[PDB]
Amino acid sequence: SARRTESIFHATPEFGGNLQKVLVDLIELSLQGKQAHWNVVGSNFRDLHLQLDELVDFAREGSDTIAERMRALDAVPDGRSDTVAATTTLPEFPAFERSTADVVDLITTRINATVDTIRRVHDAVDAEDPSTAHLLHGLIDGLEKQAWLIRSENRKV
Amino acid sequence: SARRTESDIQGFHATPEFGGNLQKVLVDLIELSLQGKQAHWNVVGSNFRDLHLQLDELVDFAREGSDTIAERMRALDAVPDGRSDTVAATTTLPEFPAFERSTADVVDLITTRINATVDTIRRVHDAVDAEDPSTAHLLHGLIDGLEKQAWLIRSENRKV
Amino acid sequence: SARRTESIFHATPEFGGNLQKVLVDLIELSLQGKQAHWNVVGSNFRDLHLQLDELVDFAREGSDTIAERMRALDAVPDGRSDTVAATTTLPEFPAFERSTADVVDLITTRINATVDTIRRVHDAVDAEDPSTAHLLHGLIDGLEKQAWLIRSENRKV
Amino acid sequence: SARRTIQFHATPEFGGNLQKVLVDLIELSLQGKQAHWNVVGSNFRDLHLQLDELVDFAREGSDTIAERMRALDAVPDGRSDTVAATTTLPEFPAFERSTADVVDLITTRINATVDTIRRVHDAVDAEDPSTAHLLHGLIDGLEKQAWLIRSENRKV
Amino acid sequence: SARRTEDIQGFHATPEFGGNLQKVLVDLIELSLQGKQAHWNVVGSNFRDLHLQLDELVDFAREGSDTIAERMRALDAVPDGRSDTVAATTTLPEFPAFERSTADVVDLITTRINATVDTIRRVHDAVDAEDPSTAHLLHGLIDGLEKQAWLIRSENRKV
Amino acid sequence: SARRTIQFHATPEFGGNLQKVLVDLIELSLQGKQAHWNVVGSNFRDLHLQLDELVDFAREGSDTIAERMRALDAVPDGRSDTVAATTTLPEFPAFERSTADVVDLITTRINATVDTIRRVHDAVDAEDPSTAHLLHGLIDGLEKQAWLIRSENRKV
Amino acid sequence: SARRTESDIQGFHATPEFGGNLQKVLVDLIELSLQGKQAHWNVVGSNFRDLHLQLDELVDFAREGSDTIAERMRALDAVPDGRSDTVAATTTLPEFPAFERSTADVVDLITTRINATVDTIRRVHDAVDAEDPSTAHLLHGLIDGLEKQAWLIRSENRKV
Amino acid sequence: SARRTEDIQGFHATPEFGGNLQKVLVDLIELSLQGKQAHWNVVGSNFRDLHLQLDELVDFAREGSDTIAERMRALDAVPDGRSDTVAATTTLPEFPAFERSTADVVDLITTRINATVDTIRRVHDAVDAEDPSTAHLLHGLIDGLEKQAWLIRSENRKV
Amino acid sequence: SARRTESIFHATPEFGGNLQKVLVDLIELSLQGKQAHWNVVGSNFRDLHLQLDELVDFAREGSDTIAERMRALDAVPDGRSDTVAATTTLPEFPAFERSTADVVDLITTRINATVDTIRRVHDAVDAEDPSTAHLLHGLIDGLEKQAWLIRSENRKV
Amino acid sequence: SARRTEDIQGFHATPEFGGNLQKVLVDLIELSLQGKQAHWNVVGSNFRDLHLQLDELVDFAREGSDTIAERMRALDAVPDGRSDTVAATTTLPEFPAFERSTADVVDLITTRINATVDTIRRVHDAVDAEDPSTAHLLHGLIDGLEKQAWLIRSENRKV
Amino acid sequence: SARRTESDIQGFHATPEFGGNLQKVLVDLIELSLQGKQAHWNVVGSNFRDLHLQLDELVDFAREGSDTIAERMRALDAVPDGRSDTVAATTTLPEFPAFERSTADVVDLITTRINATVDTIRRVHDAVDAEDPSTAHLLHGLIDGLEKQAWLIRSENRKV
Amino acid sequence: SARRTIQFHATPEFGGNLQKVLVDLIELSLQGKQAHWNVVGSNFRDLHLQLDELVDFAREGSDTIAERMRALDAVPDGRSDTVAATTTLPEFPAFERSTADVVDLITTRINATVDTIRRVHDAVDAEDPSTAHLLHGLIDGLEKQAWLIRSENRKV
Ligand SMILES: [Cl-]
Ligand SMILES: [Cl-]
Ligand SMILES: [Cl-]
Ligand SMILES: [Cl-]
Ligand SMILES: [Fe+2]
Ligand SMILES: [Fe+2]
Ligand SMILES: [Fe+2]
Ligand SMILES: [Fe+2]
Ligand SMILES: [Fe+2]
Ligand SMILES: [Fe+2]
Ligand SMILES: [Fe+2]
Ligand SMILES: [Fe+2]
Ligand SMILES: [Fe+2]
Ligand SMILES: [Fe+2]
Ligand SMILES: [Fe+2]
Ligand SMILES: [Fe+2]
Ligand SMILES: [Mg+2]
Ligand SMILES: [Mg+2]
Ligand SMILES: [Mg+2]
Ligand SMILES: [Mg+2]
Ligand SMILES: [Mg+2]
Ligand SMILES: [Mg+2]
Ligand SMILES: [Mg+2]
Ligand SMILES: [Mg+2]
Ligand SMILES: [Mg+2]
Ligand SMILES: [Mg+2]
Ligand SMILES: [Mg+2]
Ligand SMILES: [Mg+2]
């Protein structure tokens, strides 16, 4: 009666490209987070070691969320190492052992870079699909929380 | 002191139109749940088990969604109708066919019916968002969850 | 030695029809239970709200059990909205908000109707397949428990 | 290589708006516990239990808001004096209160809390939609609590 | 260097102490049995809350009776929780037969919880004088049961 | 539309039969705890632990039966005086009892409890097969407990 | 007082015939468990994973069932024999073939062997029910659980 | 045979007893509020450990305040945990505003925990004299809070 | 750059045969363990009953581990009743009820037989694939623990 | 209004109090070590029950030793749980070497549990006089250990 | 007394060669994890769901493995490099192709890449075992877990 | 039928080697708890918590080794006197110790414990590779603990 006949959302390829930008930075952040997690040394090692894993957990869940949102709307994600390295906007993480103080500053900057990407694409994403912007909001919130939890170590008052 | 002095402070009340838009979402979510179980029981053929299991996950989400929408209506002083006669008379989903259906047919059928459910939510979205962005927040989660289900189900039939 | 050769239970279509009768009433009960769960208001709202969800949980598990028992014996269930509405024996649940006292009486009657269907088909089911009657017994027990738990609210002694 | 060679900061007004939500969430939590302990009469147990769920949500909410402030370089103040001095919630009364009275009282004070979030919503959303996302969850959860509590007093 | 070179016997309860814990035990078991009776036979306004709270009371009283009985065993005393002994020696007013209204059950159970607590409070000082470690267990029981009493009786309180 | 425009009630005899099962289940539970506390000697711990599992099953069983009575408009009586006055179980002795004695005693009293359920089974099944379903679960569980306990005393 | 006065009250004792009927059920449940694992390891081809996983669920149920039946025998003073030689010499199930088997073949093979196991339980049912309805209660659960497994497995091969 | 034939009233707290538990309650609630303030606003060396430990302290103080308040209710006393009352009657030194260093927070919170414990220790003997079962709850609180104090203050200890 | 081209461990059939020897003895042990679990009677029945189930749990997990290791290396396990009975090295478990003392000695011997098979094939397995020997070590350790836990019942000191 | 304006110091244990808890600590640690020794080396009739019960005893004694040691820290006292100190200062009779029969182990461990409890009972009143909150923890330990003693010793009881 | 008297006792230090061998294992495990997720998102076609799910299990194991190896390096005073540029420049795995891939293609592709990862571990095994058998213990678990994944994935494509 | 018609026993040297590992594992556990209680200063909480994880691993390890000895007909001695008299670990000091000192002290004593396992490894592996399997897990876990603890004191 209100039933429709069988003959049954299309996202633009630009929209997919915007999600792809978010994806590579989330993957890069997870990879750098693990690097820091392994190679951080010095005062308050353990807290940083543990917090960095929490960050990585969130970034990995986030990248799965974004990639699978792309798939739901029939976009095609690319999370391959070469693509991530070639297209990420995050500054490269330095090699070797790094002091806890250095790691705090480095990782804060890299989180902030990842968040910036999401904030940069937000309005274009929101205009086409507010339901995707919903996921972006959760990511921004969770990442900016991680930034606060990590950077607070270096704050002098 | 910054304390308010009213003895009675009323809550947010939904307009009749708003209540109607959520009612439209509700009946389609319930219908999708009923069709989801029908497919879950009656799917046969290649890759039976995966579809059987995925369809239950879809049903779980749709049932949680219908409860969320109906209870959101109650929170905003609107009154849901999820009775079988109403669902049958007012759902926009194409009817699920009778009897056993092949895995390939079930994939196509259920994908279409999820698409129909999501379309209802997307149709009322802007009007809902305009009156109450907090309800739109719930609609966003529903759209995301359902379109995820659509991908997880439909991909069975997608070739190369 | 005691091994049989490869060349290997058939239920009647009437038996399937009997399970179908149980199925539609279980689904209808779940749908009405949710309606009541949302729309119940008044004294002792919370207990009814919560108990009605427990009833719905049991009825949903029950309808899955029956439908899948049908499938196991190669019967074909029909739990579609139109079929449920057109064939259920349960009295229609009234529209709008209902008082807790009214809901107690209404839902008790609808549980009792569902149980009656199972009791009506029991002997025919038991005669053909005692293993199915086993499931019927569990349902009757669980539903009649729910009836007691709900109706006790209105009992005056 | 697309790699860049980086400080979002809340405006004072934005921080002030979240501070307003915070004190009402904390006050609601304190009032919820007061009601939880002191409610008496017909259907005591349901109210007792539901009020604790309200408090659980409101406490999670206040932590969420305060930590969002921290994330955006704002500084929360959830101290007792500040809460008492700046909360917009009508004062919850002392002593034993009937279930009927508690239902009415708590519904009003939840509604007051939601009103604050609804008042600041548009300004918060204009500056930071990600924070408004949190406000939506709070509005939804609290208005649900209001429905679950107030339905007890509904006549027909 | 400081090692003892003794068999080292454990602390043994006096007959008075044993008797005092036996008194607590029978009232805890009686309360459990009456709690179930009420759990099953309560009817009327707010049935579900009372039905559920009565089971929590029974859970606590059963754990309590086990705790006391095993405390007796630990101190070389012998519990008797048999039906005849409980019926013959409990201080609790008899629970009435048949279906009982929620209002009636609230009043009845509150009274029986209070009777159980009274028994524990009556023996407390004598128990505490001999073995403060056992008084520790009595404190937990008094606290838990008086909590149950408040949670139940508040239903009937009219303000 | 097949929609109808509705009161199963147990006969007094049926209710009486379930009452018989109930008092024996409760008595078994009380005796099980008595044994649980007072058993001593070789293999104490196993018996101590197994007896608690017996009590757990018997308590769940008594609740199941009493609530089945309620479901069918019957009224249980599980009070101490009634249990002592109407139970068919041989009295469990007071004081410390050896593991060997406890095994024999408890097996007898489980068997007595099962015998009651087996005695009323056919009459219960004739009126309500759904209740007999519950009796079967009880018979199975209790006879399992009897086997797990009595095997301790088996000679070869 | 209504207390009985016997010092020794014996339990229910199964007849030799009853003990034999449960023994028949036992060996087929164990054989099904062994064949279930064989198929679980050696299934290859289209939809491998679903069958691999479902076969373990079947094995879990059959193992729980064999324990239930053997322990029911013990409860009724009967003595089970679940040794490999006895199972091999007295099972009624057709032999599972050797080596790797295709998903389609495994579906057909295992369905047949579940059907065989259920047939044994249905064959002894009435004789078991006549002596002890409480044991028949267990048989009912076994039949229901196993026929559910049969449906969940066989549906892979059912076309349209 | 031994069954009582009375309504049997429960144990009722004296006004002094009620007042004493109210004193404990407001300090527990104040400590909770200050604990969250510190949880949010702590910055500097070893932030995370302090952030996390402060939440554990708050968890314990919240459970504690609920326990005390419900103990009051069980004994027919009436708690007041409202913001105005807590602010007006707490004995805790005010927590300062704004971001505070980890070193500062350690010292500040240790002092406020100690103040809370002091209140409990001050009322203890009077509570114990009337109701040892309540003193039982006070012992758990003193133990838990003094543990929290050790776990926090050890950060600033220089050996 | 270090990437290999697409055109990509092969175990000998003798290696597979060695794992097969372990498999049949693990399955036989599980079957005998259940037999003992059901039919053990007498002093300390309960401990033996419970410990025998723990043994069976370990042996069942072990046989799955070995069979699936065979599959991973493209060997083909045979755990069928006839094959197990015809090829197991374990002494037959006796029929009927057995005393706890007898069961202790019997099961200890059968565990020791199963362990002996693993120890006999160890060096040949280790030489070809140390990663498989890794699994053998876990099994030997777990089984010899079970042997100690069971046999200690009969130890007189 | 009622806020204090002080640094507020915590409760500090006297040297006698510290010494008394140290005595409890070494006996709890010794009991744990002997419990494991027995856990590993027990053989004979009813091995499994004893093997398993001995681990439960060790679990309780380890939690107990941690509780006491951290209670010392909370009150500004310093524990010493090192091997040499425990060996040199424990009051427990030495556990014998090699495999021991279940009957022997029951008697041996019962004696060593009783020795541990005796230490706690000996210091109790002095601890209770200074700090009833610590006596609260001692009551839990006495209760738990005497329960373990009953559960173990009952194996050897012949009636 | 048998107590040692040194104030400082150093831990086991890995040779540069040993550190390099574990680094080789690390980059291939990370690369496998990245490719595993790519396949997990982009697989389409017959039996989509099973592969989708199994690929996540593979990713979970590989991620746990990379962490284990990197942390083992840290324990032995070696310094891991799991950065994207390094992984891309030094992994031995063939590149995963772009875009959506069929279930059959993904099975073949991923099996090959697991085989490649395992080959790296087997190549460095003997040199690792020679210096530190405790690290070889970890390599054994990795090889076993990964070859299990290979079987569970590849069996989809194996015919009769 | 391939059915056989059966006593692995450790040599005294093998048993002695496992005894050496056992006493160092127990001593490490006791020292870990001492450090857990008495550590003070900057980053107290992390050290406090990490030391308990070390103790957890070392206790599981000592039980594993002692029970492996039992499995192979050897007899462990984990008594206090024996541990104090035969452990190779440098004595842990009494009294409060700074986090920096505890890091250095505990790292040394973990390294001492690992050294013992590494010293006996080859002899153990030659006789019983299945026991060496357990030693590998212990070496891996303890050296991980050493890294997690010592990293606190690392300069750059
Ligand atoms: Cl509730
Ligand atoms: Cl699956
Ligand atoms: Cl932490
Ligand atoms: Cl046990
Ligand atoms: Fe995913
Ligand atoms: Fe709901
Ligand atoms: Fe289902
Ligand atoms: Fe927080
Ligand atoms: Fe007990
Ligand atoms: Fe119940
Ligand atoms: Fe079993
Ligand atoms: Fe509470
Ligand atoms: Fe498997
Ligand atoms: Fe600790
Ligand atoms: Fe890690
Ligand atoms: Fe152990
Ligand atoms: Mg939004
Ligand atoms: Mg928006
Ligand atoms: Mg039946
Ligand atoms: Mg209620
Ligand atoms: Mg005292
Ligand atoms: Mg035993
Ligand atoms: Mg029948
Ligand atoms: Mg190895
Ligand atoms: Mg006390
Ligand atoms: Mg599949
Ligand atoms: Mg080797
Ligand atoms: Mg830290």
Strand partners, L8: none
Write out residues 61-90 of B within 8 Å (CB-CB) of G: none
Instruction: With beta carbons less than 8 A apart as the criterion, state whether L2 and I88 touch.
Output: yes
Tokens of F8: 């199963």
Instruction: With beta carbons less than 8 A apart as the criterion, state whether L30 and L83 touch.
Output: yes
CA torsion, ordered H7, H13, H15, H17, to nearest 10 deg: 180
* φ, ψ (nearest 5 deg) of residue G158: -80, 125
Distance A124 CA to ligand 5 centre (A): 25
Residue B137 in contact with partner chain C when CB distance is under 8 A: no
Q: Which of G37, G40, G33, G32 lies closest to G103 in space, CA to CA? A: G40
**Beta strand extents in G2-142 (DSSP E only):** 43-44, 101-102
A61 contacts: CB under 8 Å, gap ≥ 6? none
Instruction: With beta carbons less than 8 A apart as the criterion, state whether K19 and B122 touch.
Output: no
Residues of B in contact with A3 (CB under 8 A): 91-95
Tokens of I47: 């401990």
Chains in contact with chain H (at least 3 beta-carbon pairs closer than 8 A):
A, D, E, J, L
Distance K78 CA to ligand 15 centre (A): 15
Instruction: With beta carbons less than 8 A apart as the criterion, state whether A11 and A73 touch.
Output: yes
Distance I27 CA to ligand 26 centre (A): 29
**CB-facing half-sphere around the CA of F48: CA atoms within 13 A:** 20
**Angle formed at CA K93 by CA K89 and CA K99, multiple of 5 degrees:** 95
**Angle formed at CA I50 by CA I45 and CA I51, multiple of 5 degrees:** 100
Tokens of I157: 């000191």
Residues of L in contact with A47 (CB under 8 A): 43, 46
Distance F91 CA to ligand 9 centre (A): 21
Question: For chain H, first and last CA: distance in Å?
Answer: 69
Write out the residues surrounding ion ligand 13, Cβ under 5 A: I 64
Identify from B25, B29, B41 which residue to disrupt to test chain C contact, counting C C-beta atoms within 10 A and taking the largest count: B41
Distance G24 CA to ligand 23 centre (A): 21
Helix (H/G/I), strand (E/B), else coil: H39: helix
Alpha helix positions (H), D4-128: 12-38, 44-71, 80-86, 99-127
Instruction: With beta carbons less than 8 A apart as the criterion, state whether A89 and A113 touch.
Output: yes
Q: Which of D11, D19, D99, D22 lies closest to D59 in space, CA to CA? A: D22
- Report the C-alpha gap between J78 and J18 in whole angstroms: 7
Strand partners, I99: I41
**Beta strand extents in C29-114 (DSSP E only):** 40-41, 98-99
Helix (H/G/I), strand (E/B), else coil: I41: strand
Write the residue in J52, J53, J157 that is nearest to F41 by C-beta. J157
CB contact under 8 A, B74 and D147: yes
- Report the C-alpha gap between I67 and I34 in whole angstroms: 20
Instruction: With beta carbons less than 8 A apart as the criterion, state whether K152 and K54 touch.
Output: yes
- Report the C-alpha gap between I84 and I23 in whole angstroms: 9
Distance K50 CA to ligand 7 centre (A): 18
Instruction: With beta carbons less than 8 A apart as the criterion, state whether K96 and K35 touch.
Output: yes
Helix (H/G/I), strand (E/B), else coil: A88: coil
Do β-strands B101-102 and C40-41 pair in parallel, antiparallel, or remain unpaired?
unpaired
Residues of K in contact with A85 (CB under 8 A): 84-85, 87-88
Residue G102 in contact with partner chain K when CB distance is under 8 A: yes
Radius of gyration of chain G (CA): 18
Instruction: With beta carbons less than 8 A apart as the criterion, state whether H93 and J5 touch.
Output: yes
Q: Which domain holds residue L77?
A: 5-156
Strand partners, B102: B44
Structurally, chain F folds into a number of domains equal to 1
Nearest residue on chain J to F98, judged by CA atoms?
A: J159
Residue F104 in contact with partner chain I when CB distance is under 8 A: no
Q: Which of L137, G112, D39 lies closest to I138 in space, CA to CA? A: L137
Q: Which ligand does the CA of I43 lie closest to? A: 22
- Report the C-alpha gap between H93 and E50 in whole angstroms: 44
Residue A92 in contact with partner chain D when CB distance is under 8 A: yes
Strand partners, G102: G44
Write the residue in H4, H74, H133 that is nearest to E149 by C-beta. H74
- Report the C-alpha gap between L146 and K72 in whole angstroms: 11
For the beta carbon of residue B15, count every other beta carbon within 10 angstroms.
Answer: 13
* φ, ψ (nearest 5 deg) of residue F72: -100, 20
CB contact under 8 A, I153 and J46: yes
Q: Which residue has the tokens 């304390």?
A: B3
Tokens of J73: 């820290």
**CB-facing half-sphere around the CA of K96: CA atoms within 13 A:** 32
Chains in contact with chain I (at least 3 beta-carbon pairs closer than 8 A):
F, G, J, K, L
Residues of B in contact with G159 (CB under 8 A): 44-45, 102
Write the residue in G34, G73, G79 that is nearest to I96 by C-beta. G79
Tokens of H90: 């707490």
Q: Which of L47, L144, L61, L64 lies closest to L105 in space, CA to CA? A: L47
Identify from F36, F37, F40 which residue to disrupt to test chain J contact, counting J C-beta atoms within 10 A and taking the largest count: F40
- Report the C-alpha gap between A112 and A147 in whole angstroms: 7
CB contact under 8 A, E93 and H4: yes
Instruction: With beta carbons less than 8 A apart as the criterion, state whether G42 and G137 touch.
Output: no
Distance D77 CA to ligand 17 centre (A): 27
Instruction: With beta carbons less than 8 A apart as the criterion, state whether J123 and J20 touch.
Output: yes
**CB-facing half-sphere around the CA of L153: CA atoms within 13 A:** 16
Instruction: Say which CATH number the domain at D39 has.
Output: 1.20.1260.10
Tokens of G100: 């790797």
